[PDB]
Structures are given as C-alpha cells and as structure tokens.
Amino acid sequence: EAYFRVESGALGPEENFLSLDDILMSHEKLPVRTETAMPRLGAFFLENAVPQGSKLELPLWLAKGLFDNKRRILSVELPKIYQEGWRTVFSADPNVVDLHKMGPHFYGFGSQLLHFDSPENADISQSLLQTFIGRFRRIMDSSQNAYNEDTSALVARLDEMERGLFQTGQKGLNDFQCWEKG
Amino acid sequence: LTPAELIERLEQAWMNEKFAPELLESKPEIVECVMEQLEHMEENLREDLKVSIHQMEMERIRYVLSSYLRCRLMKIEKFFPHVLEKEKTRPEGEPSSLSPEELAFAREFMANTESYLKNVALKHMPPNLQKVDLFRAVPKPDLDSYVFLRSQHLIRYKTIA
Amino acid sequence: MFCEKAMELIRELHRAPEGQLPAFNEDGLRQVLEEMKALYEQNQSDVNEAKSGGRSDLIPTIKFRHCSLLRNRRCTVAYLYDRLLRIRALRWEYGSILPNALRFHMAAEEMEWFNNYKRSLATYMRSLGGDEGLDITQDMKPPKS
Amino acid sequence: MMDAAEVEFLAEKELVTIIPNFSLDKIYLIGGDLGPFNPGLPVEVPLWLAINLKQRQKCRLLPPEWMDVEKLEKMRDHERKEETFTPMPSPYYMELTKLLLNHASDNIPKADEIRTLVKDMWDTRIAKLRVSADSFVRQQDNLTLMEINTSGTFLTQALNHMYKLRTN
C-alpha cells in the first residue's frame, strides 16, 4: 500500500541497517569458540570472566562484531546444515528438506555466514543456489494456486525468504482474482 | 505540442516512473502542461451529455497525472537522503530528477524525520553515538533489480539503465 | 547485555499483520536506552582502567560491549523508522484527520512528525497549479465510471 | 509494476464499435475526436465511453470481430498447439472480455460459452508461463501486460534473489 517497509539485503553483501527482517535474521546464535579470556563477562554466560576456549552460542551479529582475520578473539564453525554433510543431501533433492526446522532464515544466514572467511565459502554458495533454483518450482506452483492443505503443509517447510516469495505470488493470484470478479 | 500527443507522453513518463526503481528525470513540462490543458477544460465545461463526456475524459487525465506524481513522492520518501543530495551532486549539465516543489518537500521531509529521531530517542543515547548518518541508514535504489521493458522482455535494470 | 530487550521491540512490529500500528512502546524504549547508558559507563570505565590501570586483558570485554551499544542502536532506530513508514501510510489511507484510534497508539513525537508531514505534503500539492494546485491524494484508484 | 486496475485502465483506451440511440455533434476530446453520433449508425469510440453509454442505456455494443466463439475456439487450439506463446488478437484480450461480458453480454452472441473459452486460453497460457519460468531461473515476449504483471512481481523477486545469491 502506502506502507513500504525496508526490504531485506542479507542475500547481497551486507545487511540493511534499517531492515527489520535483517536484524531478526542476524539474531540467531552461532557455534563460536573463545581465544582470549574476557573478564567481567561471566554473569550473562552462567556456567567474573570467561576462560579461553569456551564453546559458545552467539548471535550472528555479535560473533561477526568480534571476529577478524586473526581469530584473536573468536573461533567459529560452519553450522551442521551448511556443512558439506547436508550440502550433499540437498544436492540429492532439495524439495524435500524442511528449510524451516533448520535455520528459519536458511538463505539469509547462509549468505552472511560467508564473512567468516571460511575456506569452503565457495561450495556453500554453489549450494545456496542449487537448493533455491531447485525449489523455485514447488514454491511458485504453490503460490500461483488456491490454498489447500498441500500448501499448508508445503509452507510449513519453506524458509523465511521463501515464505516471502510464497506471499508475493499469493498476492498477484489474489489481485487478479479480486479483479476477475465483479 | 498537441493535446493528443501531450497526454500520450504523460502515459509514458507515467509508466516509465512506475517500472524504473529510481526517481527518474523530472519532466516538469508534461506535468505543467497537462495541468494547463485540464484547467482549460474545467473552464469551457462550466450540453449535458457532451459536458459529461468531457468530465470523464478528465477523471482519467487526472488519474494518470496523480498516479504519476504519487509514484514520484513515494520514491523520494523511500530515498529522501539519496535524492536531497543526489541533485546537489548532479553535474549542472544534466536533468534535475527532482523539481523545485519536490525539492522543498524532500528537504522538509528530512528536517522533520531527523528532528524526530533526535528528539524522541536518538539524543538520550550515550555521547559520541547520538547521531546517525541517514545517508547510509536508508537503503539506496537497487539499480541491479530485474524489471520489464517494452519487442518486450525482462532483465536487470542496471544494464538497460 | 544481549540487546534482547531491543528485540522484543522490533518483534512488536514483526507480529503486526499488514502494517498495522501497535501502540508506541514508551516503556520498552526507555529500558533499551537505560541499558545503553549502563553498557556505556561500564565500558568507558574498563577503557580508563586500561589506559592507566595497565590491565590490558580487557580489549575483548570492551569490543564485546561495543557491539551491544551498536546493536541496541540499530534496533532502536529501525523500530522508530518502521513506525514512521507505517504512520506515513495513514495519511494516504484515512485522509487528513487521523482516526482517533491511531493517535491513541502513537507517541506525542509521532503525531508531531505526522502533522509536520501532512503540513508539507499540503504545501507541495497546492503548488502544482493555480488556485490550490492539484490534490494527488484523491483518485487513488483508476475510475470505474 | 502495474495492477489489474491500472492495466485495465489501458484496455479502456482500446477502440470498440457501438451503435448509439442518439444524435450528438462531434465532441472534440483532448485525446482525439469522436465522430458525430447518429442513432442506428455505427461509430468507433473508446471502451470507456462505450461502457459508459452502454450502462447509461443509450447505445448498443458491437462485439470485436475476434470475439466469435468458434473463432477463438480455433485460437485456443492454435495456442495449445505451438509449444511457445501465441500472439493474441487484442493486446488486452482478457480485459475486453471481462469488461464486455460483464457490461454488455446482451450484445455478445452467447456469452457463457465465449467467456469460459477465453480463460481456457489464459490458463494454458499462464501454465506455459510457469514452466517457461522454471527454465530462465534454472538455466539462469508476445504476452499481454495483464499477464506479465499478475505474475511479474513474483518472477521479478525470484530473479532479484538469483543474481543476489549467484554472487552473494
């Protein structure tokens, strides 16, 4: 309408400062290891400080706010799903995966996850497409058609950027039907 | 030019500004003219059936003119920072994609928004962090976005741009 | 210290269906700022305690807190802006006077921004032609008759 | 992008033929002229005026040459024939059918039949637009504005996510 929100950007290089979607995405914890001890910071992480090496779960924004090319403050590991482990099962058939149970922001998180200069960055990206361009169909076919419990069951498996495509296609199919009528 | 042509043009500058993801060049002519042609009619207008037919043609002439500017305002507000300056940073020799009315508006827009942020919460923040560079807070029009151009087809706007 | 409070603020907005405007969260915003103030002092201190107090093992603890200040800010700004994006629409929807229902969900600062917004849009249009330019708020949908 | 309403507004600029029941001099409209009106005497006027006069009960609308049953019924097949998109009669074939069958079915030779016949060509035209989409995305014209917008925005986004993820 007249309300044009700030669209996402998590799929491009950086996020969008004012994007509600992006702040929401970047708030998902992440597998992170400690390097140098951090005093005072021991009350929040209930286990006066935090030893070096501690395995932690930190918001993608925090982990990214501390990470650098020296790992002199943080160590990070590619979450189990972005690992070549599943990166193969997706290659098999993506249109079966439950991209919602897994990281709800599958694509967005995956993209921002590149900053951590992982060596295997390439292989990830060359899968963030293989799994989208691979599901592009079942998503469109669901949007460009009236609701049924096949979409109510399909939707329960799309991630946050797909549930979005879903709506959009569900919008034009409902703009034209609100026209084809009287 | 001719009424027939004029209007025809408006429907171009209208649809162009509606498929292009960025505040296109200001066409203050097509605008002030159709504005003039219309008022011209409203006069000669104030028979029955004849008049009525002219009013109907006007509600359409109006519709597009409005739908048009209404689209521009939406764009400037959606990018008030990259516009209020984009003009100042446009080589004098090119078309100001923003007019003198849209100027005092895009200008007013920020002076209202900025004051809001500050007063409401941005000023009660820890010193050396109470200011925000809207020039980077608000996203810029994505030129690299796919559109539809008319032999008609679709492809990233940047390349065509 | 995890900007969790700020989050419940952008959520109060993500859980708003179309682009509805929930009541301004005065309380939430205050708890978000007061949290920054705290995050500030207790970080500036460690900063001083490091420049003089020698103890350098603090850099980590400082950067960490810095992220918090920034995050807490990104969120508190995005929130206040999205409400403005919504309030703006209210103009092109209900007209010039606001449904006394919305005034009731806005902050005195927002109604102020709005009246200043209308006040200018008013000027703009009124300059599109002689005798009060051309109102572009009407004729929202192409004529059907 | 444009929505149905906005696109229809363009279909309404389209010329149609009507036989009026009144006499009116030549009206000089801003966007052209509209030949003198004489009862029982055919005149070409814009679809918006037509529909206005039609419901104002002062005229009779003449179905476009192509809106003939067996005529289109012979086009749907030529569409379900060629693997690709078949060039349409009226570049708003869908609108004119909707506007004329809702406002002037009286003048259309058997509507109920022609109506359906038309959509069966929009459906097996959309279908072909979906399968042809799966492609451009994967491998990374001749349509009506009403088709490239009711699906436009979606396909638009998908592509904005391609080049964005295909680069990341």
Side-chain angles (χ1 to χ4, degrees), chain C residues 5 11 22-23 26 42 44 48 53 61 72-73 89 93 96 99 103-104 106-107 111 122 125 133 137 143:
Chain C
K5 233 306 168 184
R11 278 171 178 147
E26 268 217 303
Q42 304 177 55
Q44 191 186 57
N48 294 310
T61 304
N72 271 300
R73 196 189 54 135
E93 251 43 72
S96 186
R103 288 186 180 297
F104 199 88
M106 301 164 82
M111 290 159 86
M125 302 184 321
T137 65

Side-chain angles (χ1 to χ4, degrees), chain A residues 134-181:
Chain A
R135 312 214 303 183
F136 175 74
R137 182 181 308 177
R138 280 187 159 187
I139 299 177
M140 177 181 73
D141 293 350
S142 186
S143 57
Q144 295 289 61
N145 117 295
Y147 154 88
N148 37 67
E149 294 194 59
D150 290 68
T151 65
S152 186
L154 178 288
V155 165
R157 277 181 157 53
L158 290 178
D159 94 305
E160 297 300 79
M161 85 122 266
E162 282 164 345
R163 275 148 115 91
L165 251 191
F166 182 77
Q167 295 186 64
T168 298
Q170 179 74 179
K171 172 189 182 177
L173 206 293
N174 276 329
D175 170 54
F176 169 84
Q177 287 188 175
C178 179
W179 176 81
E180 178 153 294
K181 59 192 291 186

Side-chain angles (χ1 to χ4, degrees), chain A:
Chain A
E1 46 154 330
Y3 163 57
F4 33 100
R5 65 160 197 177
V6 177
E7 55 285 291
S8 163
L11 276 55
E14 247 309 303
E15 294 163 43
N16 259 83
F17 188 71
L18 296 179
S19 157
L20 299 187
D21 259 275
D22 280 336
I23 84 83
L24 222 57
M25 173 282 284
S26 63
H27 195 279
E28 310 301 81
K29 319 308 177 190
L30 184 72
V32 63
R33 180 187 297 175
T34 308
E35 296 298 273
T36 70
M38 305 184 303
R40 330 293 180 180
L41 274 44
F44 215 63
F45 297 97
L46 297 308
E47 63 216 7
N48 59 163
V50 284
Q52 312 185 316
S54 315
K55 316 290 280 188
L56 291 170
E57 304 278 50
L58 297 180
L60 188 63
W61 61 258
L62 181 56
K64 183 175 59 181
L66 268 42
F67 178 96
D68 54 63
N69 286 313
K70 177 73 172 55
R71 286 60 178 176
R72 53 177 69 171
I73 165 68
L74 244 47
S75 289
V76 183
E77 178 208 3
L78 292 66
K80 298 105 293 175
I81 183 169
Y82 298 106
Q83 297 186 191
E84 65 293 76
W86 294 75
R87 187 161 37 190
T88 293
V89 176
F90 285 4
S91 305
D93 179 55
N95 296 52
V96 67
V97 187
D98 188 346
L99 247 52
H100 173 267
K101 275 184 181 176
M102 309 303 254
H105 292 80
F106 185 80
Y107 298 92
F109 202 78
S111 174
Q112 282 300 81
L113 201 53
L114 281 38
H115 280 53
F116 293 131
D117 205 305
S118 175
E120 48 181 359
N121 274 182
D123 196 5
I124 288 177
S125 308
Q126 188 195 62
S127 195
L128 278 187
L129 287 279
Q130 164 277 299
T131 55
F132 172 35
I133 288 69
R135 312 214 303 183
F136 175 74
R137 182 181 308 177
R138 280 187 159 187
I139 299 177
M140 177 181 73
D141 293 350
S142 186
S143 57
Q144 295 289 61
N145 117 295
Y147 154 88
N148 37 67
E149 294 194 59
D150 290 68
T151 65
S152 186
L154 178 288
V155 165
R157 277 181 157 53
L158 290 178
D159 94 305
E160 297 300 79
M161 85 122 266
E162 282 164 345
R163 275 148 115 91
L165 251 191
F166 182 77
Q167 295 186 64
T168 298
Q170 179 74 179
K171 172 189 182 177
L173 206 293
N174 276 329
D175 170 54
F176 169 84
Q177 287 188 175
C178 179
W179 176 81
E180 178 153 294
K181 59 192 291 186

Side-chain angles (χ1 to χ4, degrees), chain C residues 9-22:
Chain C
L9 215 50
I10 97 294
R11 278 171 178 147
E12 177 197 67
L13 258 45
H14 165 71
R15 307 189 211 295
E18 66 88 355
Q20 317 194 175
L21 190 74

Side-chain angles (χ1 to χ4, degrees), chain C residues 39-119:
Chain C
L39 277 174
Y40 186 49
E41 313 173 313
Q42 304 177 55
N43 199 57
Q44 191 186 57
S45 170
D46 289 52
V47 166
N48 294 310
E49 206 254 51
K51 287 173 181 168
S52 62
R55 192 180 182 182
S56 182
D57 63 357
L58 296 179
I59 275 69
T61 304
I62 326 293
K63 291 188 71 71
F64 183 98
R65 288 200 202 75
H66 195 45
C67 289
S68 284
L69 282 313
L70 296 186
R71 216 300 186 301
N72 271 300
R73 196 189 54 135
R74 182 194 192 198
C75 298
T76 188
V77 172
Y79 167 95
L80 289 184
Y81 190 63
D82 211 72
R83 298 182 56 90
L84 285 193
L85 288 186
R86 300 187 180 202
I87 301 177
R88 176 268 188 187
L90 267 43
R91 174 69 188 66
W92 308 86
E93 251 43 72
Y94 304 74
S96 186
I97 76 297
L98 294 298
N100 200 65
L102 291 298
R103 288 186 180 297
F104 199 88
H105 282 189
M106 301 164 82
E109 277 60 52
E110 292 175 317
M111 290 159 86
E112 193 176 356
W113 177 94
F114 188 79
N115 291 314
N116 285 325
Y117 170 80
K118 69 164 61 174
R119 195 148 279 270

